[PDB]
Design goal:
Elements: E1 2-10, H1 27-36, E2 41-45, H2 49-58, E3 62-65, E4 81-84, E5 88-97, E6 117-125, E7 131-138, H3 144-161, E8 167-172, H4 180-186, E9 193-194, H5 195-198, E10 201-204, E11 224-228, E12 233-239, E13 254-260
Parallel strand pairs: 1-2, 7-8, 10-12
Antiparallel strand pairs: 1-13, 2-4, 3-4, 5-6, 6-7, 8-11, 9-11, 12-13
Domain Endonuclease/exonuclease/phosphatase: 7-251
Keywords: Endonuclease, Exonuclease, Hydrolase, Nuclease
GO molecular function, one term: 3'-5'-RNA exonuclease activity
Length: 261
């Protein structure tokens, strides 16, 4: 009875060196995509404070959640969650650090090479009264142990905050389905399904990183995922192909039409 179009998307942090691929030339394209596909909830990665502000300005019907990963304020990349103000209410939300102590702001962890975070929010469908949780994160590309720990940490936080109620985890994990981190959240006592592998219908491309269309399709990998608890129904998934002319990011967003039960 509760339908929600979810999406995870790495927007590529604002870097003047990107020249024609700089955030300034993608700002509108990204906002437009979101409103066009009528995204209900979006977990985005690599979002700098100025970019976070542009999103709020370009998505007036939405609202953002999260803080900088360097000082828990505005410094560093955000891993925010945007949602429809009129559709969902935020009962509670916060952000913790993927490390030995998730409460130590700016703290790195294990094999980590860069400080990492996860932003979550306990939502409520202000129409059906349905409660669910959303967790958006960005994993370390170098730290192996850190990745395994980050996954277990997220699971413990989902059970802590929402227990066995519907929860959806999105983010950039910097690994494919062949990694171990993917296996730790996929083969854990607390079941988490890969929305892409369980969707009744899948459209689009099968990779999520192309480095601004510079990597040939055949050599592209999928490093972005949408994970859901066993109760949620994954109606469909789509990963729109990047467009060399009107490029949105070096990554491809992953949409998912879900149904909470």
């Amino acid at each position: 009875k509760t339908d929600v179009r979810w999406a995870t998307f790495n927007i590529r942090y604002d870097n003047p060196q990107d020249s024609l691929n700089n955030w300034q030339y993608r700002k509108d394209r990204v906002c437009q995509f979101i409103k066009d596909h009528e995204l209900d909830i979006v977990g985005m990665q690599e979002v700098l404070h100025n970019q976070f502000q542009d999103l709020r300005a370009g998505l007036p019907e939405y609202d953002g959640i999260g803080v900088g990963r360097d000082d828990g304020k505005t410094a560093g990349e955000y891993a925010p969650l945007f949602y429809r103000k009129d559709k969902y209410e935020v009962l509670d939300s916060n952000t913790f650090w993927l490390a030995e102590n998730p409460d130590s702001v700016g703290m790195m962890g294990w094999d980590a090479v860069c400080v990492r975070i996860a932003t979550w929010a306990k939502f409520k469908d202000k129409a059906t009264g349905k409660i669910f949780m959303a967790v958006n994160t960005h994993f370390d590309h170098v730290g192996e142990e850190a990745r395994r720990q980050s996954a277990l940490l997220i699971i413990r936080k989902i059970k802590e905050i929402v227990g066995e109620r519907p929860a959806v985890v999105t983010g950039d994990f910097n690994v494919t389905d062949a990694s171990d981190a993917y296996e730790t959240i996929t083969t854990n006592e607390f079941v988490m399904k890969d929305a892409y592998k369980t969707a009744a219908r899948v459209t689009g491309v099968d990779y999520t990183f192309h480095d601004f269309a510079r990597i040939p399709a055949e050599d592209c990998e999928k490093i972005d995922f949408i994970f859901v608890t066993p109760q949620v129904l994954v109606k469909s998934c789509e990963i729109p192909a990047e467009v060399p002319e009107a490029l949105l990011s070096d990554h491809n967003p992953q949409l998912a039409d879900l149904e909470l039960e």
